[PDB]
Structure 1
Amino acid sequence: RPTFYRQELIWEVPERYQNLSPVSVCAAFDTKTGLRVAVKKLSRPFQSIIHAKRTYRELRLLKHMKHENVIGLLDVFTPARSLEEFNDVYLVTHLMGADLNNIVKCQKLTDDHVQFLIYQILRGLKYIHSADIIHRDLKPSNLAVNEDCELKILDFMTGYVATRWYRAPEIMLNWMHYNQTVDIWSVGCIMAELLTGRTLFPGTDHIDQLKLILRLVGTPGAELLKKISSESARNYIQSLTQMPKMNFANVFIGANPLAVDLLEKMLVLDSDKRITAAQALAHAYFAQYHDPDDEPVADPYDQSFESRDLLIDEWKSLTYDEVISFVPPP
Structure 2
Amino acid sequence: ERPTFYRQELNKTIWEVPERYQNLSPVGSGAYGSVCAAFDTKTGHRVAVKKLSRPFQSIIHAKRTYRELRLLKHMKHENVIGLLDVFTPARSLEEFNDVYLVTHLMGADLNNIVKCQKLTDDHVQFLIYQILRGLKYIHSADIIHRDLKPSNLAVNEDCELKILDFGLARVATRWYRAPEIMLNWMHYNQTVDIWSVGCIMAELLTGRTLFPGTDHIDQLKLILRLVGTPGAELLKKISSESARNYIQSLAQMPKMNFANVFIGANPLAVDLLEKMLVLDSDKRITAAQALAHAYFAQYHDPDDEPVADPYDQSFESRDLLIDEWKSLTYDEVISFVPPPL
Q: Same fold (TM over 0.5)?
A: yes
How many angstroms does 1:161 deviate by? 5.2
Q: 1:108 to 1:197 in 2, by over 3 A?
A: closer
1:105 Cα deviation from its structure 2 partner: 3.0
CA–CA distance in structure 2, aligned partners of residues 124 and 34 of structure 1: 27
How much has 1:286 moved relative to structure 2?
Answer: 0.3
Note the C-alpha offset of 1:230: 2.1
Any conservation in 2 of the 1:138–1:166 contact (CA below 8 Å)? yes
**Gaps in structure 2 of 5+ consecutive residues:** 28-33
- Structure 2 distance, partners of 1:329, 1:84, is 28
Asked whether the 8 Å contact 2:224–2:253 carries over to 1, the reply is yes
Alignment CA distance shift 1:96-1:251 (3 Å): same
Pick which of 303-312 and 97-106 moved more: 97-106
How far residue 108 of structure 1 moved from its aligned partner, in angstroms, is: 4.5
Contact in 2 for aligned 1:77/1:323 (Cα 8 Å): yes
Deviations 1:18-67 (A, max 9, x none): 11111111111112122211111113111111111111001000100011
Cα distance, 1:83 vs. partner? 0.5
Mean Cα deviation higher: 41-50 or 252-261: 41-50
Instruction: Give the stretch that moved more between structures: 45-54 or 158-167.
Output: 158-167
| Separation in structure 1 between the aligned mates of residue 167 and residue 251 of structure 2, nearest angstrom | 26
Q: CA RMSD in A?
A: 2.0
1:125-167 Cα offsets, whole Å, 9 max, x none, are: 0000000000000000000111111110011799995221000
Which residue number in structure 2 is paired with residue 266 of structure 1?
276
The alpha-carbon deviation at position 221 of structure 1 amounts to: 1.2
Contact 1:55 1:319 (8 Å CA) reproduced:
yes
Residues in 2 aligned to 1:21 and 1:161: alpha-carbon distance in whole angstroms:
25
User: Shift in Å at residue 176 of structure 1?
Assistant: 3.0
* Residue range with higher mean Cα deviation, 124-133 or 100-109: 100-109
State the match for 2:165 in structure 1.
155
Does structure 1 retain, via aligned residues, the 8 Å contact 2:118–2:206? no
Return the alpha-carbon distance in structure 2 between the equivalents of residues 208 and 8 of structure 1. Answer: 44
- Determine the C-alpha separation between the residues in 2 that align with 1:64 and 1:13: 23
2: CA distance, partners of 1:257 / 1:139: 24
Is 1:16 equivalent to 2:17 in the alignment?
no
Partner Cα distance (1:46, 1:29) in 2? 28
Query: Aligned partners of 2:51 and 2:61: how far apart in 1?
Result: 14
Pair 1:82–1:97, CA change in 2 (3 A)? same
5+ residue gaps, structure 1: none
Aligned residues of 1:159 and 1:206 also touching (Cα < 8 A): no
Contact 1:159 1:205 in 2 (8 A): no
Contact 2:118–2:204, Cα closer than 8 Å, also in 1: no
Corresponding residue to 2:249 among 218, 239, 245: 239
* Residues 189-241 of structure 1: CA deviation (Å, up to 9, x unaligned): 00000000000000111111111100110111122223222221121111111
Q: 1:106: how far off?
A: 4.3
User: In terms of mean alpha carbon deviation, does 279-288 or 167-176 score higher?
Assistant: 167-176
C-alpha spacing 1:20/1:159, structure 2 compared with 1 (3 Å): closer
Question: Quick one: distance in 2 between partners of 1:190 and 1:41?
Answer: 29
Separation in structure 1 between the aligned mates of residue 84 and residue 167 of structure 2, nearest angstrom: 32
Counterparts of 2:245 and 2:167, CA distance in 1: 23
Match of 1:221 in 2: 231
Aligned mates of 1:251, 1:159 — CA distance in 2: 34
Q: Distance in 2 between matches of 1:87 and 1:113?
A: 44
Whether contact under 8 Å (1:159, 1:203) holds in the other structure is: no
- Alignment: residue pair count: 330
- Contact 2:118–2:205 under 8 Å retained in 1: no
Per-residue CA shift, 1:82-102, capped at 9, x if unaligned?
000101111110011210012
Residue 325 of structure 2: SS of its match in structure 1? helix
Q: Give the secondary-structure state (helix, strand or coil) at the position aligned to 1:191.
A: helix
- Summarize the Cα distance change of 1:161–1:315 in structure 2 as closer, same or farther, 3 Å threshold: same
Decide whether the 8 Å contact of 1:160 with 1:204 is kept in 2.
Answer: no
8 Å Cα contact 1:160-1:202 kept in structure 2 = no
Judging changes above 3 Å, is the alpha-carbon distance between structure 1 residues 223 and 160 closer, same or farther for their aligned structure 2 residues? farther
Deviates more, 1:277-286 or 1:24-33: 24-33
In the alignment, structure 1 residue 128 sits paired with structure 2 residue 138: yes
